[PDB]
Design a protein around this ligand. Sequence first.
Ligand code: GDP
Ligand code: MG
Lengths: 180, 319, 90
Amino acid sequence: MAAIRKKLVIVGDGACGKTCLLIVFSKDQFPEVYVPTVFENYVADIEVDGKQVELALWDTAGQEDYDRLRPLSYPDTDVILMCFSIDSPDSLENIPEKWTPEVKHFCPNVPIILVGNKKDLRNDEHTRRELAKMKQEPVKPEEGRDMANRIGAFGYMECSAKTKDGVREVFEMATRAALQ
Amino acid sequence: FNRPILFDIVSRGSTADLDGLLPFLLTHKKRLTDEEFREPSTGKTCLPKALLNLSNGRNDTIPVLLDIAERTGNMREFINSPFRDIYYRGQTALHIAIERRCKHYVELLVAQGADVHAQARGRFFQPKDEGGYFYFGELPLSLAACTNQPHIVNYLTENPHKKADMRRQDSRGNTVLHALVAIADNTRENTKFVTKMYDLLLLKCARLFPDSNLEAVLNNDGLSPLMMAAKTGKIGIFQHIIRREVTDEDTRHLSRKFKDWAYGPVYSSLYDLSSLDTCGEEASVLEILVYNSKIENRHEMLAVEPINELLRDKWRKFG
Amino acid sequence: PLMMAAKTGKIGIFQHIIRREVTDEDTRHLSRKFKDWAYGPVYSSLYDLSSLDTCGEEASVLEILVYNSKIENRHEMLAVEPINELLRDK
Ligand SMILES: Nc1nc2c(ncn2[C@@H]2O[C@H](COP(=O)(O)OP(=O)(O)O)[C@@H](O)[C@H]2O)c(=O)[nH]1
Ligand SMILES: [Mg+2]
């Protein structure tokens, strides 16, 4: 029948795999060299239970003037995909301080999902050494659930855009929450 | 080169001054959808400016801009870029090309990959009750239907590339048939093209989808087009829907009035008591008319041929 | 001059002075209804609030129109774009 359209907004810190996740979901191909700052004006076809849903993927950035026009993307949203890097936890601790209030103040009563992008780096030796140089450890799944507890988000799933693992169930959960 | 220069070259339609845009964009790695080429507080790119400043109905800068955008990679982003302002949010270039009554550029945009199901959510695209001017259903196909443009409707529903399905609903749930009821006045001309387009779309949806009835998809308020016509004080489309007769055998099941027999001037016709006397388990047009139809047309809709006798027949039975 | 117009109930000159724009680049200091953007009917503008400010440091035209002005055009002069919008803002 008619394919409903749901508005999806992906917010997160700089270089936390937002645009890469969107491109992997949409074009099925991980960008090699030229990854855009924002993946904009794309609608993706998805089906969860036979109900076709067109996900209007909206991308936000915090660089140059994109920070100023990021608030204008929030109106009419249906699901919010807050993004943090498993590699660098600084995004994880800065979620509740900045991103959760920002999302809630412009998107009341809207489902919230926080996703652990860069899941492949959890076991990466280089990233582990870089974190140990700064006395840090990769975000644990238990830590992700603990962060979701503070916000009260719809769910927490980890994504690895480079390996194309988890890039589908996250959007399925997002459109399921939007369908509510 | 720069947006004040670009929006003037586009406005004047001078392709001779637009030659150097592509080498500049390629060597600077800039794109036509960049904020440096978009009007602030509006979000308008060069394409709406070209679609607004039309001389002789054509702007030669539009093909050049489309070619340049394809070369730079921003084709879908360039064509489907929506307005970001409060009063025009969601308005892509397809809505502008349809409202300007330029079928050629509508075909050009849809062929290149325009978002045919783009919803315009600005305050100017809200019902007059909610503080708006032009509520057309928020869809590019609904805009064409409410603008009385049958050729553009036929093209959008019969594209080789991407066809606008007629069963789609906007944020409020109104389909094309629901949007033809909110743009319908009681004047003779409005009641003469709104009903024609309503029948055109209903028959098109009956042929294209035999198993689906486009008049049975309720909006977010649970109102079918007949129910919304009864509620919002539209009598012409109300009478047309109730007294509907269609001759085509393939789509003869959409009739609501069935001439049972005829003897000279006298003829007996069966009226479908669907959504009118539904025995309570569903919503009824009669209840909407006698409770929620505060319009002054209530005493004129309570005189339609089935409704007037439907109420009277109830009086004899148990009344 | 604007205060005199408000007191004497001159609707035309008060309406002009409130929304006066000087297109010349040499003197943008005298314009009041600055224009930000304008697409179609929308003519979104930024009205100066000089002599119309909320603060009571200097004489306020809102006070003059509400209390001092006894002219029959008082209702007409309160219907200008910034003054009416200013009251709803409060
Ligand atoms: N190892 C790994 N690297 C990634 C993944 N996703 C993105 N990256 C890299 O992270 C960089 C920044 O990602 P990007 O999407 O540009 O950040 P954004 O614009 O803030 O979303 C990119 O250049 C990618 O190469 C991932 O899942 N695993
Ligand atoms: Mg990005």
